[model samples]
Target chain A: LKTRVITASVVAPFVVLCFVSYESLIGLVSAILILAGYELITLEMKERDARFFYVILLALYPVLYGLVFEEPTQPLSILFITGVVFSLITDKDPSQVFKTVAAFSIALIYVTFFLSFFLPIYRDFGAANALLVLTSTWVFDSFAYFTGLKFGRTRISPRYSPRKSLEGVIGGFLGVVIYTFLYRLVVNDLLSVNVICFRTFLPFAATVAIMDTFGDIFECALKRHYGVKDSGKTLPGHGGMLDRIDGLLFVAPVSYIVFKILEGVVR
Target chain B: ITASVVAPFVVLCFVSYESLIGLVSAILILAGYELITLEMKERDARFFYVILLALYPVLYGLVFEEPTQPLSILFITGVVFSLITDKDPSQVFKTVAAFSIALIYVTFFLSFFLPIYRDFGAANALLVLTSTWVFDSFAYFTGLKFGRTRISPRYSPRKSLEGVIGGFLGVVIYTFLYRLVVNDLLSVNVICFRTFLPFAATVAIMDTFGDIFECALKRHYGVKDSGKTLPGHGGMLDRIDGLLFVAPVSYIVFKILEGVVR
Candidate 1:
């Protein structure tokens, strides 16, 4: 708790103080990606016989995403499909083929396809809302963690996560709603900045919070499959970088689509 | 050989019979490759290689640039030849595959020089020709003088490994000297060609391989020369052995250097 707060306090301003820019976005995404890459490489090393070429092919996703999002015609969908096709053709063993294809598909889609939402996200909604959407995930996490621990006697998916429960999700959803109202109020007072879709923004925030939980569940399944308790140890109390950022990755694309429709309504 | 050396600069610089020249020679060399293969394969009934070789380049060059060309119109010539020839279907197809390979090899490698001459201008076109022809001359004479050991005594008895090395240096030196003189006198750009030594060496090597490959092909067929048409100067196939390979090799070199510069 102490390490996370201290790290967040130091990291948040270095990120937000400069306003939301592409350079900072690239830096932030790349930093998380480095840890994610390490997590993935370590995961793949134990599974069957994975050579370094797959990992290198995995690395091309983020960079290719950056390029493809700039020009959507640049053959990204084909490249990811190529990964699946490559695994199918090269490995005759059915179990090995399934593992390679499934892992490659997840890495490519999650890393490139979802991260691509950031480009138009920043372009459409100013850096202020972008940061606000980011901040809400942490709010969901704290509320869910404390709420799940106190009254939660059930596991949502026992195989994936041992501690998540129905009570915690209700707590997290209510917390996101209340926190978003507070967030808009605080920003209104401090910076005199108004939320663009003032009326409809609440639903967007609540939906983001809901998606954030699914993100956690999905990542939990991925991590638990590889038999890792945490994505990393460098962060002390925070399981790993993926441990910290998994929810954000999941919610980002959802938030992008929601805001896009809201922007259409406003226009 | 003189016509081969001088005619390109003449036509490119002055009286431009560009497409006609590209059409005729491409046809002639391709015809030569096809006919030679046919004879080696126990003969064509009507010697359609002579006509068809001329036909592909003539039609493709003139009309292929336009996309509206229908396949039936283009393939009608071969269909007409097919009806008259009373050859076995299987044997004719074997010849057809051999013809396709020979056509692609000679046409793709040989006729590529026209485009290089067309775009790269007179000065640039001559540079490649000068290095290639000069290397061929030096290799032949130098081999006669200093070449004691034959490279492959049966297939290519005239060629020596020593002559290969000596001829290679002659190309590099010649290219470097021309590059220096042009950079100083005309003050035109050799910077693109200034990576002169490597390209010079590469062209020399490509030229040698073209010679070796052609010699091996002739020996396999048990023919001493491709034909007796050009007596003092070997025939169409014989003289063009180096010319066919040199153009594409030089063009490829320029593409790389220009890309590096860009």
Candidate 2:
């Protein structure tokens, strides 16, 4: 019954939103957020997986809301705060309130701090700019996955992450370069002079690949510390919110910073 | 959900039809085939996919609803031939039946000579074509960048709540482009364009990641490629499933909104 209700609660708004006007879509997202917040609070008190659904719902609410509202910053900030709060509250063996606060601050600074830049990247450069960044990362990840699966001989950091391989890093970088070049050709009008330059594009691609790799490793560290296979099981085919967003959280901020610095230099 | 998804399409196909009764008949025919095929064996059932492949031809026939469009009868004939040949056949009989079906249904029977068909301009067709393609591309790239969290990991590891946002972004892009390129050019900037853009985008977006949707179905059915006919492309049905799911609705939504606006 709960599952059915939840499914209805989840799907109904989305269905309506598909046919409704843009303003109504915003209303739907806001309602979903409020419901999710209530679910989260209730689930936190119960200490169960029901909260996981709220997390997924909450995570999604912002993307649509942000896009429609043209306010990317709010959603990114919310996600950052949410992550930090989760890290603090989930610590089972906290030494003291002050210590917990300090640890939480560091965790927030590390994870959420960089992710906050993503909104500004989208806002300043336009959504398509964000799309380009995303496409580059996706191609990088895809190539890395296939490359590492096939030819990974040397472990990058076996103790820290047994699955990662040096071969994957090379493949990821190559993938980014190839994708960036192709993306430029397809959407040449969108490309800025600096973006089109090989010097800028190469470093930008390399930085994204490296940052993405670090982000994955960082999440692995967190999962190890928490002793969980995934952060949650809300997704049916994928593992958790954390599993999916780990790369985005890291790469988005780094790309934002890179684009910012390049913008200044180019100007 | 499927009915709602397909409603806009039925409406659009009806509008595209020259005769309302003829359009209803065509739909009933397709739906009837769908129902009947559900009870058939694998060999006996293979004809349904081929018959359904003639949906475009059926639409062309019903839209004109004329004797010239009798070429559309090929779909029905194709199914009949498939049914007959499914029985044990000698080599000579098998080759003859296959050639007959091909000649009658595919080569000689299509309304390729219909002059009114040329009235369907590139601009109108391009509206649907470009919107679908752009939406698919935008969703893919957008999902990758922003899909920070998974929506349904078990059904599709690649799909994320973020990807849906990306899909929406794609829809918005296609919507804008459809308006700027198609509607504006055609001087048909009605509220229908507004309605069609979002609706078409939604369909195209769903169609883009339809593999994950199928993965869910596959998981349920415990089968991979609904069939293995197309090699890298999967079955002919698998290849067209996403388009089939989206096209009917997309066509309908555009036509209804177009009527309301007009």
Candidate 3:
């Protein structure tokens, strides 16, 4: 823990300093490489070889896509959604190959697939739009956790995971509503010009919340199957890389698709 | 200490509207409950009944500062001091509280502090502040690799007590040389009228180096990390608490001395 603190103390400020100074592209590229490299080195490969390769591929694809293709979303989405479906189906069996395939598929969907929407979103609605969507997830997550923890009586799925409650799912839905409206109010500029109606936001948030809950369950099942408590020991108080990204994996794609549809309608 | 704690809260209340009140309050209540349960009803009731009942308000007054940027330094020092003074302190609570405090403090301070510097036509003060970064990174690796003797074996055994001295001397020398060279080329007007250039750089370096010294104290007290907020980083204090200590000192010294000297 002391070692971790010392190292983090040295690194975090340097990172903040870099963030304040470096230009956007340079910052993005630097961050991507550093984070992806860290993930690659730290993640266990022996147990899930195919999944590991998939993760590396997923990490590299965005940087490569950003460099080469003006509209990389089409290809990225194709690869990612296919990966998710493949992973879901692989869960039909419980083998190492299946696990790797599942994990790779999920990574493809979560990282490569969803993140593909970023460039287009930036181009269309400007940077704030993307940030709005990103930060609102925090609101959604917070409300869900609090509501679920307080009133969560009925077990959602006791066998796969005992702790998660049905109330959490409901809380997540309610959270999305609160978050969307609050986001609209707080970040008025982002919402003002956009075609997103209050009516549309409710459905969008609800769907995203439900999908997010499923994503959490799916990950829990994977951990149970693998006989591990966490995906990896990456975060200090937080669990693993996978643990951290699980919510984002679900939220990003849903948000991306919703934003795209809203854009088309607004235009 | 009182001013250090109160001033920041005042700042925070005045500045950012998005307070961390909910999260902080929730955690505190939970922690208090846990402590009560762990010590048992009777013992815990008596313990808190006397000590914490009075102490909690004072501690709260210190912690619950507005405009919480400046007071951050004081709060961090308070945390370090608390850790050092308290015997068999609740590691979890101390770690959590210290970190939460640090996070709130640094984020608030930097959010405002950077903009202030930038607005003052030293947009590059931030970039130039990289000197501290460079100094810290280089000093740590250098000290770790070449440190031959223990500086404070009782406190931070792994830290070469010599390394602390070495780091300070190295930074001071580097800052002096850099200042001399920059002044020669740029002229006074180019660098904040060469007002607080060397002094600021020195203080920044000192502040950065001081973190290691503070960490040594935590180590001596037999704590792992101050708090567990970030992944690799411990609590907020663990990350930039040292800066809190050094920042105010630097500012006050530079401001007061600059007034007298000029």
Candidate 4:
């Protein structure tokens, strides 16, 4: 518990510091992605399969380059190309090739591609919108944890994530909605800048809560598949870099899409 | 080989763009069947694969939406479907994972041609096809003559480093020739060196990888061919494996060049 608090305190402000700067944010996102890629590739491959290094490299190639290029679907293209190439080049055992390729492709598309949305989100929309995404997710997590502890009855994902409850989902939703207004109020008052309006931001916060819930469950499902209790022991209590950003991974893309739709339609 | 060569030419020259989309969708759905029946049958989740493959044409053909929109919906559906149908959570993850691969590899990658056809018209579509085939012939002949280093000797014994180099040279020259012949004769907008070089490179690399990828799949099942659909050529998949991988990346290459050139 002590270590958990210590790690969180150290890491939270550091993330915000990088998040406030574009180039630093890329450095932070890239480092975290590489770490998460290592955790996922190691989890998927057994020890005898010594091709995990190349697999992670092939998977990370697209996202790293995609961020540098600033083209969104470029990742999709390079990822498919590199993944197939990786599968071919590493064909030591034909039987294991498909499994390796499937695992590699999944990590590339699901983990790498999804998380790289942060780059574009921060680039296109400024720090205020991006920070809203980060902080509101944290707020929802706290609310959901406390609420699930208090009024826990039915599990949301009983098989994969038994800790999640229906009551907690509602709590998270309400918490995000409340936090959105509070965040806007503070930013408007102190920074003298009006953030997103209530009409648009309400649904955006709702999306974060919902996607964040599913994201956590999805990671839990992945852990359940590997039969691993934690993704890794990189962080003291949080498990690994993946364990920390599981919810944020899914939230980034949906939030970007939401903002884009609002810009096009609501304008 | 005659059927494979003749049919696509007829389709590319004769049909409307929507028909081209339908044709690609039909081919993918057929390939999806062969894939699941052969490699994916061990999973006890044939129903998921079948349903997703079945809905693929509707998703691509009728909905006429961006690739990601319908795709994400289908993905979420697959997850929910797996969760509801399977008793074991472990089994559900496997089902979801396998289904996701099938979606991306076959359905998603192949569908990029729709946008290519939509945006660039039939000439560019034909360029994709001819460039890939040109690379294949060059690689085969060149490797047969001067091949030394095998690329993936176990899975794809015929592919070699010399062959890829030859194939790369062949496709690059072919792209320039294609731009000249088509642009002059048909009065179509074709190439700048900036676009052609990168486009050719992307196609050549992807084509080799695509063929090798299918070889890996075939060897995994201990089968020489995906199916006996074609007479001398292995299967429909064997002929177009390169094209499937080529289409998506090529689409992005074009998009990127368009961004730069414009």
DockQ of each: 0.01, 0.01, 0.01, 0.48
Q: What lDDT tens digits, residue by residue, belong to model 3 across residues A74-138?
A: 23433433333333333322233232333343344333444444444545554555555545565
In Å, candidate 3's interface RMSD is 23.8
Q: What tens digits encode model 4's per-residue C-alpha lDDT throughout B109-182?
A: 77676777667766777788778878888988888899578766576647777878888889888876778787
Higher-lDDT candidate among 1 and 3?
1
Which has the greatest DockQ? 4
Where does candidate 3 chain A have its weakest 10-residue lDDT segment? A90-99
lDDT of 2: 0.46
- Interface RMSD for model 1 amounts to 23.0
Q: Which ten-residue region of model 1 chain B has the weakest summed lDDT?
A: B66-75
Instruction: Give per-residue CA lDDT, model 4, range A159-232, as digits (tens).
Output: 66647877888898888888876788788777865466777866777778777877777777777888887776
The residue-by-residue lDDT of candidate 3 on B150-238, one tens digit each, is 53323333555455555555555555455556567655222333444454454444454345443443443346555443344455345
The sequence of per-residue lDDT tens digits that candidate 2 reaches over residues A1-267 is 557566646853563333234344344434433442332233223446434433453435344434643433223323423432343245333222122222222233333333334445544554445556755766777898899889857876434333777788889898888887666656665554234444568777876787677666655554544445564554433455456556655666667656665654332
Off by over 4 Å in 2: A1-107, A160-162, A189-198, A265-267, B1-262
Q: What is the TM-score of each candidate against the true structure?
A: 0.44, 0.36, 0.39, 0.83
Q: Docking quality tier of candidate 2?
A: incorrect
Error of 4 at A216 (Å): 2.2
Sorted on lDDT, highest at the top, how do the candidates line up?
4, 1, 2, 3
Give the candidate number with the greatest lDDT: 4
- CA lDDT of each prediction against the hidden true structure: 0.56, 0.46, 0.44, 0.70
Task: Give one digit per residue, the lDDT tens place, for model 1 in B1-262.
Answer: 5666645753444224355446446546544654345344445633565555555444444554311121112122332343235234323333333343344345435545544554454455667766777787788788878957765334543677777767777877776577778777776444354667666665666666555545654554556675665535566677667665666666666655644221
